[PDB]
Structure formats: structure tokens, C-alpha cells
Design a protein around this ligand. Structure first.
Ligand SMILES: [Mg+2]
Ligand SMILES: [Zn+2]
Ligand SMILES: [Zn+2]
Lengths: 1202, 69
RNA sequence: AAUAG
DNA sequence: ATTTTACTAACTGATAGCGGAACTTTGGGACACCCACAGGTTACGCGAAAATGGC
DNA sequence: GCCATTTTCGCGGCTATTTTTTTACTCCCAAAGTTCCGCTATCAGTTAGTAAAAT
């Protein structure tokens, strides 16, 4: 229907065209008949009838008279919904300045007229005159006159000049401006200017002036003469129960405006003294400002409730505004909510849904099937049958929900796995049954959690639920590619208990024909689960090439391991099961099943694993008791020794040998060492036991203690928590953060006393408060990321670019922090991977790196590769599939139409709650910094070289001595400048000292051309530069934190990308969060979207102008095709908030935040929104240009092309 | 639905093709090319796509044949 | 405001 | 010869119109002299950008 | 006329479920428009009766 949204100023004629009448009275409704009053705020003659196809007269009262205007009343015979669309207007007695174009800084009226805002308000507030037509006089336009001076010069000159005061004066000044003449004048003055401040001022004003010329807007439209009036049904006056009426504040504001306008007209008719008229004009301006934006001018007008009235700006803006409350999110039909319980019998694609809840949700479907099969004659009969709850209704409900998927949601929806589709199974009850294996995806536990349920209606929505959102499709984490349905808690415990090994168990040494006979022996009490036996195992191995090799052989194992092998799918080794299975081992089993067998086998295997784990956790009888907390006997001796040595240190303090700080430090170290020793003794005592073997000797066995089993299996519990249960609680911190000298020398088994419990509460409260506040901080960060990255969609397959990024193993010392395989898995090669010391092309260009090619890279000892990146993609809009690579949630190359920006933002934002020289290897030494290369050729030690045993190339043997989490991420993604940033070498050249000017110092550099560049340095700067040295560009002169903007300016796009990615990944890896770097690269790409033009060239770009990079690239391609001088630009790094606010579309920018500024700028500019991103199409109700809608939008782009 | 995405290649394209086929079996009078087995039109369309009977080109060809007739 | 996750 | 039906005339209710008096509603007036207002508020904090001030 | 310091401006997680608020105050009169009850009168619909027709 429509292809774009156009915004701009409104002329008086346009406002009159919108209007169906003029509001002349502040009347709303009669106080007896409750009918609209004529020419009032609710007039039926202006806005439409109050009843469908009726008039206030009651004369024309049917559809026979549609479109006929009653002569007695004037009310058109039509529908009542027209009162939601018909607008009105007020003819203002005096012009009024628009508050947005006056006080939304910077002021557009002031910028256009080149007069300060204070002067404009002085003219408006009737304090100072201003010259409109200077005439044949020394007076100039825009020069201010006081009343005294105005009277003086009125006597002096007379009618030669015109001087006015108020909004009429500003309108006359704006109407008399010659815009092309001003544009020429600013261009000429910019040609012959040197100061950068005046250059900025003239470039801003010139941009405004030429925007006004191009848009067709006239400046005097910024001063209102006709005021539009909203439809009444959008500001309703509706009756409540008991005769009370509820009204909108807009009615009060409009009534104030109308009353003051009528009083102004009456005063002008009475020829009142000028002071009264000036007062009335001030009040009219104040009333209109309050109606448009309350509180911007001054004291906000308040109603009888003593609270500020809500204006139109408040209608459209804010968290509670129309954009966010009603347009970006809505309340929906066919939805429900209930508490969630656990269904351990369900399959991964099934969810237990209550019968009554399904009956309410699927009601139209039940009506349709009752009508179809003849059980109900009409729809009212079907309604009666459903209300009476007949058995045939239940059969119809089963047939309806037979294969209809349903969507389950849990708030907060931190990532897309917070909504998944399931096949419903009708259950008796009122609680939703949720599959256990999906709980980790939902962050859902059964302690009172509630879930919402939605019914997809159309066939497309049903197929989207089945194909995309179904739980069996989403078993990999889109953030990292790791499985997300890994078993936890009881399952793991069961699999741990069944696969453990016991010495001299019943049935040891027995020979078993296979898993079935192991199960038979277990069920007959012949052998225990933990009996060491020999079992004939038939194992099938599916190789990389697809070879299926079957080998039968006798393996030493346990009964439980074979019984578990019974459910393992064919194609996997028995070594994955022939061990004790903790959480990590089961994770490995599922990962190998996915990597070597597929998706269906993995789903069946996961279901069987969870069934078996539950069953054998039940059969184990694992229980927690007070005797399971074994406190070591060494704890008391260690406490006594620590106390005695603390007394000795106190005695030394009283002798003056050591200071107070030393005493504090060594007491703390004493207690920390004591805690470590007690923990070690407790773990050693709890981890082992002594058993009698078959020969009768004593053997050491791993303990079957319940708490030890729970912790070791990874089901629940860790070393620190067992420490607290059976060892020492340890040193605790004060609310400010300092450590208390005496620790809690008691565990939870013994019980704390009052002081120890109070000290514990000190830290417990801090933890809870920190969680509560970081929730809001993380939410705001995630929203900002989603806004900045919402437009990134895979639009092509290959962009045909040769650029890429250099990838190397991450070395932060003597060990690898992360391997090259983990970084390269899923990325497309950009330059051929030649074998080291050889010219054979091991891996060609444009090949996805999967597990097989990762093993190939690892075997041949390759250090540095080059891969395609989203930051270096050349696509005009969005990115292409090759520059992105593998879709982590799907395992293959990313498909066209995938909204990867939203995925990146969710992947980064979801873990925000969790957020708070001697050689060690043998090889040679290479200098660049210090690098220690192994014999294979891989770089394994990267060390700094401050300004050495072995020189360059000299081999070194091992042992030779050659010689704040979430705020940090937010500051990195906002491109914040550090407080004391490092001073970097602006240009490459020879350093030279300079004249130490008072206050702060200066230095100079001589370039290769002999030109001298002067740098300004603060006094307190430990300069690392020496005269006569040719410092390269980007070299550090003064040490300090590095600004990302300086990195971009002096090193390039790759350097800033690496910096941001490394810092963010350092923060995330400190806490153990696995997030792929392509998400951070997508965000950084959205950060590098603007360029400032340095050379104007011949393209339609002004110097010093911040414009979109894609537009410049397209223009440069066109100009090169035309063989003309291209534009020269410097790319800019913006924060995610600033980048979001500086997008091309004003709908998205307004929907994000700062609605008034965005709308004011768009209105003065006359912007046009093409609806190219997701948010715009969400707001206007259209299909998003991603995924299933992608193709649709493409088709339209063809039809517009044709 | 791994077989269906293997036969089509793109999940979004598979959704669109299956939606067209399901609308043909539900709103239109077209009959299934596989045993229905008490299945909804969406599942029937997915099974037909998996069997290789229904593709985008096949649907376009049948639409062209209907237009010719 | 209070409460649940 | 009898029974069903079509035709017609009279009754009655709804309804548009009118009368007229009560009822609601609007505009004007009031002559000792009176002659400048509120009016609660705020223990935020942080970052940007925009407006002032310094020499 | 640029370098720093003070002043505004806008922002601060998502789903549920329990429940209204409260000061402040002339009177009278004449003139005008509107309403409410009662009556009239006309038209259309309904119903009862009787002749016309058919069995
Ligand atoms: Mg919970
Ligand atoms: Zn009317
Ligand atoms: Zn690309």
C-alpha cells in the first residue's frame, strides 16, 4: 500500500486540510443530556456521530441515509470510528512559537536566524523589540531595541522602519529570509575561513539552510498560526460506574488554549491597554507550550491531582510511550499463562498442556470442527456445547491439538531459546509440564516459575513453529555452538552412579555375552552395578569418510557401563562409556553423537540418557545425612597452630618489630594458608576409602560418600561449598571490602555463633544487592546492543572482497589462552593456507573450516591464517554468508535472511548477569617483542621487551632464564575515552623537544617531508620518546590506557576491531563465558558506520561532514565509473548509543530514545524513511526483511526496480 | 525436519513451500500425494517435500499448467 | 507500593 | 351443501406537528473602602553536549 | 578566540498478581431559549367479517 514514511513541517494550509471543522468553544458535553456541544471539543458536526448511522437530532437514524448531512444539526450519517480519525483546528489569534523548534537544543530558529536563544526569548516574552524591515536607516535586521530606544528611534525616524515584539516579529524575520542568498554567503565565508570553531558553526548553519531549501519547507512554519486538534476518541471523556467520568489531560490543555485564545480575541475587540494584551499573548504561548511539551519551558502545569498534566510529547515518548508500550510490544490474544511442573516422561518435542487451558486457547478451532462434523448446527450451539463440556468436545479438542504446535515463553527472554515450540499433550491439571532437558535453555526451575503459551494460527506460523522454533531444532547454543540440552543434576548423578567402579563387588570377574546379559545379571541379583566384569562388545565406528567398521571384542568394564551401552546409538566408540560419567563426559557423548550421527539420533539418545539417569538415580538411593559431612581431625590442630602463631605475631607487634600493616597482612596470610590446608585435608579424607579385595588385602577406592558423589559428578556442588559444609567458612569481608582478621573457624555442620553469622550476613546482603542492580544494568546494555545491530541481515552469498582478518592463537604469557582451532572453527578462508616452508595450497580460498579441516590445520602446525570477517565485508547493506561463516545454532553455513545482528546482541547480552623472563618451553628465540618458537614452528610464548640470554635465532632450552566486568563491557561498546589516555605518535618522523610553555609543555616532530608537527603534552607525563628517534605512527609516547578512537585513527579498522574484541573476550573469559568473536565483530561493524569527509572532491559532500560510509562508497563507485575525482574520508568510531541515534531511519531512532530530538531534526530536514530494517516493519505491522519475510521484501525491490 | 531442509536447502524456503502446499490441500481441493495417515496439512506437506514430490519448481509448473487449462 | 520468578 | 380463502372496511397504535406554560439558562449589575504571589524544594548519579567564562 | 568549567538533558530489566479519592464556595433579576405534558390528525398496519370460490 505504502512504500515510505515522510516527515516534515506542517503548513497552516496543511493543518486546515486535515481539519473537518474549527473548535470555537471549550465545551465538551452537556451536564444533563451528556450530548456533545456544538463547536466544542467533542462536536459531532466536526468529528462525527456518537452513534452509528444517526444524528444528534434523531431524524436520520438508519443506513438508508448514509452520507447525508442533517440540516437541523449538521451531523453526517456515518460510522462512529470516524471520531478516531477526524481532526479539527483552532485559528490562533496571535502566532505562537513551536516549543520543539525553540527549546530543543540546539534551537533551529536561533540557528537559522543566527541569533542567540536568550535574545529570541526576550523578543518572545515581550521584553525587547526587534527590527523587521530596517528601511532607509542605519538600523539592521535582527538588532534588539528596548522600549526606551524604540520610542526614541520612532520619534527620530517615524515610519521608515518597522520594529515588532513577540512571535509575530520572529515570523516576520523568518519569512523575509532569502535562503539561497544565505547559503551562498556561508559558502563564500567558509571558503575564506581558518578558525575551526567558526567553521563548525557555519557548516552546521549551512546544513540547516540547504536542508530547508531542499525539503520545500518554509522557515515561518516553525511559528504556529493554526493549531491542530486531536480526534476526540483518542482523548476520550467516558462515563465510569456511578456517574463519574474519566478524561484525558489533553482536554484540560486544549480548554486552556481555547479559553486564552477567546480572551485574546475579546481583549483585541475591546481595544484594551497594551499591557493586558501582552499578558494574554504570553499566556497563550505558555498554554500552547504546555499542550505540546509540558515542563520544557518552565514549571509544569498541574491538575487537581497536584501532578503534571500529560502532553502530546509524553503521549509519544519514553518507556511508557506509544513507541515502546504499544508498538514495539503488545498484548496478544490466544495466549495463556500457568505454573510449570516437570514432566519426566515427555519427549523433547512435547509439552504437557492443561485441558481447560487448551479448551480456552483453541476455542475457534473447536467451533469449526463441531460445525464441520455436524455435531453443532450453528456457532451458538457449538458455544453451548463447549460451555457445557461434553465428551465429544474433548475428542474434538484432541483432534484439534493432534499436530498443532504451541509456543512456550519464560520471562525474561534473554535469548531466542526463551521461546520454543512444542507439541502439546493434554493433561489433567492446571500446571504446564515442561521437559527437563530444555530448562537450561529457559533458565527455568520448578520453584514457582510461570510460563506463557501462545497459539500460532495461520499455516505459515505453524510451519515456522515446527521448522524453526521447535525444541528439537534448537539443541546448539547460537552464542558458542555448544550443546544446550546437556543433562544436569539427577540424570548426571544416575549416570555417574551406574558407571562407577567398586572393588570386590558381587559378581566380579564374570564373563558376559553382552549388555543384555549384564542387565539380566543385574536384575537377578547375580552381579552389582559396580562389578568389574568382561563383556563381549560389538562396536560400530563411522569414520569421517563414512566407512562403517564393526568389531566384536571382549572388553574389561562394569555391568552398569554395558547396560548403558545398550542405549548408545551405533557409530560411537565404547571408550565414551567405559569410564565414570560426570557432566563433562555426558556432554562429550552428546557432542560426539551430534557430530558423527546427526540430529534425530542425538534427540533419541538425549531422551534415553535422561530416562536412564532418572531411573538409576532413583534406584541408587542417594541421600544426604549429617554423617556425610566428615570433618577432618586435622582441622582443630591447624586452628590451634594458626591461633598460636597469631599470638606470636601479636607479641612481635607489641615489641615494635613489625608495623600494623605488616601484622594485618601476615595474619591474613596465616589464616588463608590454614584454610587451604584444612580444605586439602578434608578433601583427602572425604575422597577415599579402604576396602578388602578378593585376595583379602586392603585397597584404596574412591569414596561413595553422597556429598562427594554429588560434587565430583558435577550434578550440584563444588569444592568451595563442601569446604563450607565440612571445613572452614574462612575470611569474610566488611561491607566496604576490607577483610576481617579473625575468620569463621566453624562450618555449617558445627554451626556458627552470633558474631560469625553477622559477618556472613555482611557479604550475603552485598551479593543480593549486586545481583539486583546488575540485572537492570545488563538489560539496558542488551537493549542498546539490539538497537545498534538490528539492521544486520545476511543479504547475499558472496560480496567478492579479498580483504580479511589475521587470526593467530591467543598468547598472553607462556601458555595459549585459546587455540587457533577454536577461533577458526566456522570461518571462511580469505587467503590460501600454504604449508609452512612449502608452496602447496593445503586449504584453498572460500572454504568453511569444520572439524575435519580443523584437525588438518592442527596436525600440520599452522600458526597464522587469514579469514573473512563481517567487519571487512563489502556488502552495501547487511553482510554476506561467506564473510559471516557457520551458523553456530545450525552447524552449517549461514542462510540468506538470517538476522545475525539480533543474534549477536542477544549472545553478548545474555551472560551479563554472570559478569561482575624465564622460558617454559624449548625452541628458538625470534624478536620483532619476544617470541619463543617451538621446533614444529608454532609460536607458544609471547613476551614483552621493555626498553637477554639469547640473541635472535638462538635456540633456548626449557628452564633457561632469557630475561569491573559489566561496566567495562559497557564502556568498551560505548567507545568511552579513558580519563588519562595514552599519547600516541600522530605522524611518523623524528622527535624534537620544544619550548616548555607555562602550564603545559609542547613537543615537535619533523616528518619525511621536513614539515614540523607540534604536539601539546601535559607536564605530568613520563615521556618514553627520545630526540633523534624516528617514532613510527601509532607509537606510544606517554603510557596509559588507549582510546579506541586513537587506535582507529592511527592504526586502522583491524587494530580497533582486535582491541575491542580482545578486551570484551578478556572480561567474558575471566568468568568462563563462551561467546564467539563474530558477534563482537558484528557489533564493531555497526560501530564503524560513519565517515567524515576530508576532501570534498566533486561529489555532493561538504568537508567536515559526518555521512554514512555506504553512501560514500556507492558515490565513489559511480564517480570512478564516470572517471572523476573520488571523495576522501576518515572513518569514525561511534558508541552503540550514538550509532543507534545516527541511523538513516528516524522511526527506529525515535523508537530507541531521545524522541524529541530525533523528530525535530527529521521534521526540519524533511527526512524519508524507506523501512529497510526490522524495527520499522515491526512498528508498521509488515513482514520483517529477515528469514521467512526476506524473499518477500526482495520481490518488492524487484517490482520497484521494474 | 532434517530431511526436508536437506531436500530444500534453506529453512525459510522450506517453510514457504510447505505453506503453499498446505494451503493447496486445505483451502484448495488438491489431494495429498502420500498416505495422509491422519496428519494435518502441514505435516503432509513436509512429508511430501521429504519424499521429493513437492518443490518450488514443481509447484510453479503445476500452477502454469492450471493457468494454461 | 507490596509480592513471585 | 360445506369449507377455505380472498377482499374489504374499521380499529388502533405510532408518529409528526402544534400549543403553551413551566423550567432551565444566560447576561447584567451591585458605589464606605479595600491596591504587587506564591510556596514547596532537595540527601540521585553519570555521561554528553551545549552554553559561559577566562585570559 | 581557543581551553576549561559549569549547566542542562536524558537515561536507569522483563513478565505476572493484589486495589478508586478527600481544602478553597454571594445573590437577584429580567430576558431568552428549551422542555414536557396534552391534544390533534393522518397513515399504515392489523384484525374481524363476509362474500367468492372450490371441493
Ligand atoms: Mg525459579
Ligand atoms: Zn440532525
Ligand atoms: Zn562479505
Amino acid at each position: 500500500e505504502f512504500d515510505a514514511i515522510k516527515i516534515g513541517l506542517a503548513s497552516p494550509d496543511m493543518i486546515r486540510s486535515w481539519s473537518f471543522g474549527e473548535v470555537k468553544k471549550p465545551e465538551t458535553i452537556n451536564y444533563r443530556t451528556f450530548k456533545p456541544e456544538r463547536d466544542g471539543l467533542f462536536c459531532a458536526r466536526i468529528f462525527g456521530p456518537v452513534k452509528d448511522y444517526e444524528c444528534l437530532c434523531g431524524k436520520y437514524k438508519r443506513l438508508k441515509h448514509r452520507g447525508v448531512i442533517c440540516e437541523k444539526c449538521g451531523v453526517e450519517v456515518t460510522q462512529t470510528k470516524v471520531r478516531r480519525d477526524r481532526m479539527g483546528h483552532i485559528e490562533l489569534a496571535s502566532p505562537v512559537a513551536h516549543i520543539w523548534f525553540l527549546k530543543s537544543l540546539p534551537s533551529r530558529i536561533g540557528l537559522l536566524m543566527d541569533m542567540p536563544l536568550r535574545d529570541i526569548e526576550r523578543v518572545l516574552y515581550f521584553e525587547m523589540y526587534v527590527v523587521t524591515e530596517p528601511g532607509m536607516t542605519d538600523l539592521e535586521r535582527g538588532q534588539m531595541l528596548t522600549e526606551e530606544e524604540y520610542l526614541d528611534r520612532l520619534e527620530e525616524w517615524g515610519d521608515e522602519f518597522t520594529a515588532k515584539m513577540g512571535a509575530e516579529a520572529i515570523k516576520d524575520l523568518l519569512a523575509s529570509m532569502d535562503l539561497p542568498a544565505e547559503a551562498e554567503q556561508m559558502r563564500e565565508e567558509l571558503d575564506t575561513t581558518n578558525s575551526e570553531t567558526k567553521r563548525k558553526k557555519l557548516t552546521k548553519r549551512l546544513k540547516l539552510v540547504e536542508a530547508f531549501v531542499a525539503s520545500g519547507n518554509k522557515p515561518e512554519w516553525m511559528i504556529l498560526t493554526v493549531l491542530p486538534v486531536l480526534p476526540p476518541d483518542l482523548r476520550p471523556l467516558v462515563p465510569l460506574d456511578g456517574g463519574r467520568f474519566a478524561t484525558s489531560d489533553l482536554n484540560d490543555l486544549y480548554r486552556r488554549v481555547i479559553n486564552r485564545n477567546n480572551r485574546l480575541k475579546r481583549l483585541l475587540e475591546l481595544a484594551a491597554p497594551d499591557i493586558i494584551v501582552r499578558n494574554e499573548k504570553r499566556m497563550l504561548q505558555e498554554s500552547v507550550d504546555a499542550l505540546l511539551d509540558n515542563g520544557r519551558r518552565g514549571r509544569a502545569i498541574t491538575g487537581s491531582n497536584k501532578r503534571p498534566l500529560k502532553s502530546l510529547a509524553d503521549m509519544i515518548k519514553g518507556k511508557q510511550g506509544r513507541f515502546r508500550q504499544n508498538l514495539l510490544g503488545k498484548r496478544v490474544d490466544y495466549s495463556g499463562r500457568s505454573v510449570i511442573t516437570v514432566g519426566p516422561y515427555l519427549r523433547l518435542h512435547q509439552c504437557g498442556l492443561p485441558k481447560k487451558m487448551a479448551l480456552e486457547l483453541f476455542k475457534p478451532f473447536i467451533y469449526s470442527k463441531l460445525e464441520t462434523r455436524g455435531l453443532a448446527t450453528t456457532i451458538k450451539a457449538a458455544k453451548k456445547m463447549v460451555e457445557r463440556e461434553e465428551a465429544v468436545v474433548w475428542d474434538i479438542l484432541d483432534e484439534v491439538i493432534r499436530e498443532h504446535p504451541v509456543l512456550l515463553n519464560r520471562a525474561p527472554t534473554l535469548h531466542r531459546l526463551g521461546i520454543q515450540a512444542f507439541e502439546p499433550v493434554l493433561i489433567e491439571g492446571k500446571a504446564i509440564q515442561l521437559h527437563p532437558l530444555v530448562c537450561a535453555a529457559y533458565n527455568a526451575d520448578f520453584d514457582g516459575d510461570q510460563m506463557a503459551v501462545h497459539v500460532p494460527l495461520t499455516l505459515e506460523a505453524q510451519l515456522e513453529a515446527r521448522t524453526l522454533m521447535m525444541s528439537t531444532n534448537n539443541i546448539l547454543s547460537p552464542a558458542s555452538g555448544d550443546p544446550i540440552i546437556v543433562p544436569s543434576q539427577d540424570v548426571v548423578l544416575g549416570l555417574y552412579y551406574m558407571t562407577r567402579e567398586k572393588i570386590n563387588a558381587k559378581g566380579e570377574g564374570m564373563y558376559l555375552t553382552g549388555p543384555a546379559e549384564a542387565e539380566k545379571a543385574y536384575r537377578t541379583k547375580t552381579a552389582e552395578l559396580h562389578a568389574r566384569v568382561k563383556v563381549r562388545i560389538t562396536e560400530t565406528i563411522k569414520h569421517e569418510n563414512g566407512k562403517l567398521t564393526t568389531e566384536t571384542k571382549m572388553i574389561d568394564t562394569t555391568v552398569g557401563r554395558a547396560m548403558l551401552w545398550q542405549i548408545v546409538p551405533k557409530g560411537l566408540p565404547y571408550s565414551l562409556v567405559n569410564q565414570k560419567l560426570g557432566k563433562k563426559q555426558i556432554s562429550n557423548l552428546l557432542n560426539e553423537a551430534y557430530r558423527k550421527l546427526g540430529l534425530k539420533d542425538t534427540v533419541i539418545f538425549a531422551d534415553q540418557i535422561m530416562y536412564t539417569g532418572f531411573a538409576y538415580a532413583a534406584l541408587s538411593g542417594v541421600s544426604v545425612g549429617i554423617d556425610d559431612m566428615v570433618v577432618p581431625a586435622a582441622k582443630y590442630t591447624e586452628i590451634a597452630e594458626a591461633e598460636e602463631e597469631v599470638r606470636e605475631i601479636q607479641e612481635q607487634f607489641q615489641s615494635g618489630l613489625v608495623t600494623a600493616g605488616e601484622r594485618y597482612n601476615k595474619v591474613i596470610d596465616i589464616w588463608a594458608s590454614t584454610n587451604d590446608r584444612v580444605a586439602k585435608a578434608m578433601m583427602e579424607n572425604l575422597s577415599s576409602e579402604q576396602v578388602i579385595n578378593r585376595q583379602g588385602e586392603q585397597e584404596k577406592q574412591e569414596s561413595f560418600n553422597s556429598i562427594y558423589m554429588m560434587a565430583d559428578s558435577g550434578a550440584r556442588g563444588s569444592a568451595a561449598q563442601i569446604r563450607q559444609l565440612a571445613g572452614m567458612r574462612g575470611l569474610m569481608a566488611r561491607p566496604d571490602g576490607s577483610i576481617i582478621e579473625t575468620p569463621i573457624t566453624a562450618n555449617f555442620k558445627e554451626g556458627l555463633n552470633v558474631l560469625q553469622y553477622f559477618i556472613s550476613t555482611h557479604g550475603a546482603r552485598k551479593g543480593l544487592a549486586d545481583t539486583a542492580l546488575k540485572t537492570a544494568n545488563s538489560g539496558y546494555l542488551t537493549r542498546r546492543l539490539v538497537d545498534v545491530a538490528q539492521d544486520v541481515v545476511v543479504t547475499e552469498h558472496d560480496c567478492g572482497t579479498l580483504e580479511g582478518v589475521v587470526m593467530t592463537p591467543h598468547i598472553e604469557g607462556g601458555d595459549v589462552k585459546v587455540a587457533l582451532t577454536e577461533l577458526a572453527l566456522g570461518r571462511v578462508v580469505s587467503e590460501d593456507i600454504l604449508k609452512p616452508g612449502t608452496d602447496e595450497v593445503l586449504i584453498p580460498r572460500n572454504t568453511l573450516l569444520d572439524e575435519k579441516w580443523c584437525k588438518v590445520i592442527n596436525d600440520n602446525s599452522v600458526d597464522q591464517i587469514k579469514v573473512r570477517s563481517v567487519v571487512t565485508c563489502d556488502s552495501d547493506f547487511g553482510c554476506c554468508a561467506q564473510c559471516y561463516g557457520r551458523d553456530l545454532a545450525r552447524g552449517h553455513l549461514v542462510n540468506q535472511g538470517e538476522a545475525v545482528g539480533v543474534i549477536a546482541a542477544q549472545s553478548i547480552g545474555e551472560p551479563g548477569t554472570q559478569l561482575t623472563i624465564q622460558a617454559k618451553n624449548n625452541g628458538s628465540v625470534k624478536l620483532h617483542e619476544l617470541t619463543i618458537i617451538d621446533e614444529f614452528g608454532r609460536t607458544k610464548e609471547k613476551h614483552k621487551l621493555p626498553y637477554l640470554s639469547k640473541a635472535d635465532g638462538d635456540a633456548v632450552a626449557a628452564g633457561e632464564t632469557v630475561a569491573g566486568g559489566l561496566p567495562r563491557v559497557a564502556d568498551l561498546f560505548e567507545a568511552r575515552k579513558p580519563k588519562e589516555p595514552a599519547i600516541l605518535a600522530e605522524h611518523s618522523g623524528t622527535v624534537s623537544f620544544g619550548k616548555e610553555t607555562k602550564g603545559k609543555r609542547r613537543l615537535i616532530i619533523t616528518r619525511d617531508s621536513g614539515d614540523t608537527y607540534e604536539e601539546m603534552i601535559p607536564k605530568h607525563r613520563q615521556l618514553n620518546v627520545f630526540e633523534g628517534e624516528r617514532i613510527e605512527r601509532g607509537d606510544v609516547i606517554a603510557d596509559g590506557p588507549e582510546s579506541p578512537h586513537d587506535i582507529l585513527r592511527l592504526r586502522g579498522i583491524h587494530a580497533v576491531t582486535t582491541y575491542i574484541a580482545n578486551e570484551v573476550q578478556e572480561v567474558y573469559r575471566l568468568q568462563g563465558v563462551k561467546i564467539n568473536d563474530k558477534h563482537i565483530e558484528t557489533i564493531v561493524r555497526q560501530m564503524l558506520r560513519k565517515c567524515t569527509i576530508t576532501f570534498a572532491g566533486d561529489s555532493e559532500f561538504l568537508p567536515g561532514e559526518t555521512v554514512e560510509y555506504s553512501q560514500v562508497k556507492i558515490a565513489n563507485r559511480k564517480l570512478v565509473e564516470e572517471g572523476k575525482e573520488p571523495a576522501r574520508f576518515e572513518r569514525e568510531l561511534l558508541g552503540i548509543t550514538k550509532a543507534s541515534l545516527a541511523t538513516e531511519s528516524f522511526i527506529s531512532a525515535a523508537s530507541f530514545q531521545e524522541t524529541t530530538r530525533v523528530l525535530t531534526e527529521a521534521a526540519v530536514s524533511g527526512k524519508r524513511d524507506d523501512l529497510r530494517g526490522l524495527k520499522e516493519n515491526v512498528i508498521v505491522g509488515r513482514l520483517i526483511p529477515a528469514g521467512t519475510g526476506f524473499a518477500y521484501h526482495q520481490d518488492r525491490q524487484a517490482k520497484r526496480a521494474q | 525436519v532434517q530431511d526436508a531442509v536437506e531436500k530444500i536447502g534453506n529453512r525459510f524456503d522450506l517453510v514457504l513451500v510447505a505453506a503453499r502446499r498446505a494451503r493447496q490441500m486445505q483451502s484448495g481441493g488438491k489431494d495429498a500425494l502420500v498416505p495422509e495417515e491422519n496428519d494435518k496439512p502441514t505435516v503432509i506437506a513436509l512429508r511430501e517435500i521429504e519424499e521429493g514430490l513437492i518443490t518450488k519448481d514443481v509447484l510453479d509448473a503445476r500452477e502454469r499448467q492450471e493457468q494454461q487449462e
